[PDB]
Subunit: 257 residues, 4 copies
Amino acid sequence: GFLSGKRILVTGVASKLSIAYGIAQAMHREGAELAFTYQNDKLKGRVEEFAAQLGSDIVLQCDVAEDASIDTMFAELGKVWPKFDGFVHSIGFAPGDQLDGDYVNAVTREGFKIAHDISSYSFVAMAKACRSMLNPGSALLTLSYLGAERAIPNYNVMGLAKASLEANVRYMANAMGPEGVRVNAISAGPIRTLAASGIKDFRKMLAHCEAVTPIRRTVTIEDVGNSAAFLCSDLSAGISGEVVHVDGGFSIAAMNE
Amino acid sequence: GFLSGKRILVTGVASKLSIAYGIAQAMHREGAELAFTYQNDKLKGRVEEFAAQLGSDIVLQCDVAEDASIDTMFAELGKVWPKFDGFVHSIGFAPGDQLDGDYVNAVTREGFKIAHDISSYSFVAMAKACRSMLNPGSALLTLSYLGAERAIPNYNVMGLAKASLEANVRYMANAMGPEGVRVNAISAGPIRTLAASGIKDFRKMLAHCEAVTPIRRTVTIEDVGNSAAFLCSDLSAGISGEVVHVDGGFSIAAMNE
Amino acid sequence: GFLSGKRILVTGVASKLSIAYGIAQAMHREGAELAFTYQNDKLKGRVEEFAAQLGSDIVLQCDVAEDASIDTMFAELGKVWPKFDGFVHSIGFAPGDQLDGDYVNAVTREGFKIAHDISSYSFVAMAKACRSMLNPGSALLTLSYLGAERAIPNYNVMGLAKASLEANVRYMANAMGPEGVRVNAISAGPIRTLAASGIKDFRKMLAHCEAVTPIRRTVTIEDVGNSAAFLCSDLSAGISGEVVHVDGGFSIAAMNE
Amino acid sequence: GFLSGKRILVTGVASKLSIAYGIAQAMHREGAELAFTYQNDKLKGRVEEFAAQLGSDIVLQCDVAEDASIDTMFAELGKVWPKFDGFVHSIGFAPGDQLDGDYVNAVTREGFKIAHDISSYSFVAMAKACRSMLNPGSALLTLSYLGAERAIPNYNVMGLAKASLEANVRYMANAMGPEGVRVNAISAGPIRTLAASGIKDFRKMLAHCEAVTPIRRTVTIEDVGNSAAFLCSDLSAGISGEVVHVDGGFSIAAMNE
Ligand SMILES: NC(=O)c1ccc[n+]([C@@H]2O[C@H](COP(=O)([O-])OP(=O)(O)OC[C@H]3O[C@@H](n4cnc5c(N)ncnc54)[C@H](O)[C@@H]3O)[C@@H](O)[C@H]2O)c1
Ligand SMILES: NC(=O)c1ccc[n+]([C@@H]2O[C@H](COP(=O)([O-])OP(=O)(O)OC[C@H]3O[C@@H](n4cnc5c(N)ncnc54)[C@H](O)[C@@H]3O)[C@@H](O)[C@H]2O)c1
Ligand SMILES: NC(=O)c1ccc[n+]([C@@H]2O[C@H](COP(=O)([O-])OP(=O)(O)OC[C@H]3O[C@@H](n4cnc5c(N)ncnc54)[C@H](O)[C@@H]3O)[C@@H](O)[C@H]2O)c1
Ligand SMILES: NC(=O)c1ccc[n+]([C@@H]2O[C@H](COP(=O)([O-])OP(=O)(O)OC[C@H]3O[C@@H](n4cnc5c(N)ncnc54)[C@H](O)[C@@H]3O)[C@@H](O)[C@H]2O)c1
Ligand SMILES: Oc1cc(Cl)ccc1Oc1ccc(Cl)cc1Cl
Ligand SMILES: Oc1cc(Cl)ccc1Oc1ccc(Cl)cc1Cl
Ligand SMILES: Oc1cc(Cl)ccc1Oc1ccc(Cl)cc1Cl
Ligand SMILES: Oc1cc(Cl)ccc1Oc1ccc(Cl)cc1Cl
């Protein structure tokens, strides 16, 4: 596969529906050696099982709300992978009350702070912590959504956090490019995952996209996984600082209704 | 003037160099009645003096880091302006250590949090607090910078905070439009102000822009003020959720060097 | 008014519904001296009448498909206005068969050529012809539509012509800025005009926009006219090469349905 | 390879420096069966030789300025490939006088017409002609440049033609997606090719990009070729209507100087 010889860390697997799960599958298929993190014990079991199926026994705990947790996870990873080739950041969070109803009425200073901290700061927090461990030719990848570009009902403060994240991708790419590290994002279309259930009326968003997307279907975690594998491989050596839309063309059409 | 009959609150005046000062001047010239806020006692004197020169005696303290301070300022403003027509948000902040050198090395969880809280959350915090006091036809305005769209050396975490702010403009415009409130931003080119001195090599950024901007000069607080007055007036009734570049065309050219 | 002392040429008035008509009204209200062009004799009468109502007796024929017609019109204008302050380009055209049905099936080499020639090339053709007649501080303005940015059903080849036009705005602004000329565009939302009737299902586009636009109404030629007056005045001295959306926020929202 | 079983037509090979040459090499490496076109006899020899080295004996003449030439080439291709999986459009042209100096002074109605006809219309002209021959799952690809988005000195009218081309990509993707065809573009950074020598001061553009691009080197035809192979493969099934920047991050940074 085109990922043979690469060692990549994958965050965010919570279930078989997880976008990170589709990404891990595609990268394994292409020959990458993988390592996984899990947020807490509530998820340790499932992640350990999935990692086994994908030939990996490197499963480490990591809660990105804490600098100490990130530093410890990398010190542990370093015992087996003193150097590696990048990681996939597939993590997002905002308190549930933030994602329902009128945005101005729903947002709070605390909800805003947590959404940006976990959904955007954590990406550069991880890069800071493992910077000296990355091989030249390494690639970092995060996942965004159209809500960063347009106002979407109910997505609310997560939209602002994703806009901060896309800017993060550009500043990170500009800072780390000289040492040989590329940084990109995939702006994925709507997919039924555990976290998606937290967005009010998500099922309605899904049906709408299916009807108006140029390719006439919503994307799958396999579609996203294949794109992620490409973006973390040497085949995309000429691409950095980019937000690639993997939504079947939904965002470039208007009034298809 | 085209602002006759409008009552507008202006935040951010710190000196005669302040963009908010140029905005206040232009709005006064066009007939608006004004009210001003000041961050702390270190600035109370200058703001009181400027307000007098512009025919206003409404000068209130307001530190947007605190919900209580925002609520109190509006309760006080309500004693004289039970209803009004919008406000100008010209406030930004990030700890100084954040704006020097390599972005990944300089950014910290705390610096990131403060930058987003003061530079982006505060805009919707103010709208939440005065929502019931706005007249139909009201307009809110904030100030952004190109760093939200492109990676610019030294601007660092402020770029991410401005990206969150531009997204804020869109979600706010979408939420408040039905009740008759418009929300926009001006992305201004570089101008020598007090805060600008905190950006490493700002004088270099200024000279560069002057040489490559299509109109061959950097913009002034008068240029920005005139645009702000238009965007807060009924003359721009058809514009909401927009980020207008007032940088002399700098951002739409490349390689003019 | 803020246009006092300015001499502006207005193209494209075909009826009282014309966007150019709303623009002429607003500029006259703000004090500008105006001059008008008309495409052919089929329209001469109406334009002569409107010009009179707006205190102007400068009404010249000009068909932008011909270089000779443009050169002659300016030589004639020069007899009364040896120098002037800019013009409004409110002209578009594509053969009717191009605007109905599947884009790939409808487009032809000839339809494509005519659409780009009349809708985009004509803007720089006029600037080339009157370049030596423009006063420093002059401003040129054209009208675009969201179809330049997103694929919209039935708009078809006009979308490509508008994309070429928006690029034209940037190259023109970059080339003419050093001599003191600004160039911008307004991307207007849907408005019932004579030309609009040529777009299949235009009435459907109008109703849809009204329902999902943040300000909850479609824009009027007065909204566009007011913005145009501002953009051609010295109040927008800091703005060049920009495409300003005057569509009530329609383009920055998604899934409001 | 991930292109095994795909039959792709490649246009634009003129020499070993050609972007189309790098694309053909990468696609051959990944298992695609290829076919090539050549503009005229001046190029027939070189193309025949290259095609042989890549295991292909399908080399057909095609000048996209003529509808008849396009129809004939496809009728001939149909004798060997009654159905196929897409094509690569790597064709551009504008008269040389258009690419030197001030844009407004250099552009002519004829130069503008030819630039748009050959550089943008030809892409949809080819799709129209072979539409019934494409297998479900097919993908079309064209090559663009940053000049479509920003004003770049000397690129002049080609910038407008590339803006029309990027819009073409979106309208084509929207029209053909329902039948299973994806359409995308790669916006490549500067590369020394035969056509590049026609741009005044191209060597200066190249050195500048090398110094300020995040990855600190200009991209190669191999970088572009690898991205093109991915975008024409089933691995990018979730991507359509997109313009992917393969310029090492150059466009997302500002003032790196
Ligand atoms: N689902 C969609 O339609 C969609 C669309 C675009 C983007 N995304 C993005 O894709 C990513 C993955 O989401 P998903 O839909 O696969 O959801 P998911 O619920 O399968 O995964 C989200 C993951 O975030 C992790 N997470 C949350 N807080 C964390 C913390 N403090 N520390 C460590 N991990 C934490 C969870 O443990 C979980 O594995 C997110 O960035 C999301 O915003 C999803
Ligand atoms: N100066 C430039 O070139 C430029 C370019 C683009 C945008 N801007 C933006 O314009 C706005 C005004 O900046 P400026 O350059 O006029 O600077 P300035 O230093 O004159 O004004 C900044 C203001 O922010 C206020 N402020 C900071 N923290 C605050 C808090 N907690 N509560 C209340 N007020 C607080 C200060 O008191 C001060 O009045 C900012 O949003 C800035 O990001 C400036
Ligand atoms: N109507 C809308 O909803 C809308 C939305 C966005 C942009 N626009 C743009 O606004 C401009 C004005 O359109 P409108 O809707 O007011 O239509 P309209 O039919 O009132 O005006 C179009 C004008 O184009 C002129 N014209 C066409 N070919 C010409 C030629 N060869 N030479 C000289 N003049 C020529 C006509 O004479 C007419 O005055 C166009 O650029 C159009 O694309 C309209
Ligand atoms: N070279 C760069 O730095 C760069 C950057 C971005 C985009 N591009 C684009 O990549 C494509 C390929 O350019 P290149 O640099 O490889 O140049 P090149 O000179 O190697 O190839 C250009 C090709 O266009 C073909 N062509 C021109 N007119 C034609 C006509 N009427 N019919 C058929 N074929 C015709 C030529 O025969 C030639 O093979 C163009 O679209 C160009 O705009 C090049
Ligand atoms: O970003 C997303 C976008 C979509 Cl359409 C669906 C799910 C997404 O992911 C999340 C949404 C809300 C929260 Cl609280 C956490 C996550 Cl991970
Ligand atoms: O956003 C800005 C952009 C520029 Cl070019 C100059 C000054 C700016 O404003 C600030 C920059 C840094 C900090 Cl700490 C605070 C503020 Cl108000
Ligand atoms: O650009 C437009 C956009 C809209 Cl929504 C409505 C009308 C427009 O203007 C035209 C549309 C088609 C043709 Cl043939 C000519 C013109 Cl002037
Ligand atoms: O688009 C291009 C962009 C760059 Cl930076 C270099 C070469 C390019 O390609 C061309 C440029 C001019 C002409 Cl006349 C023809 C072609 Cl193919």
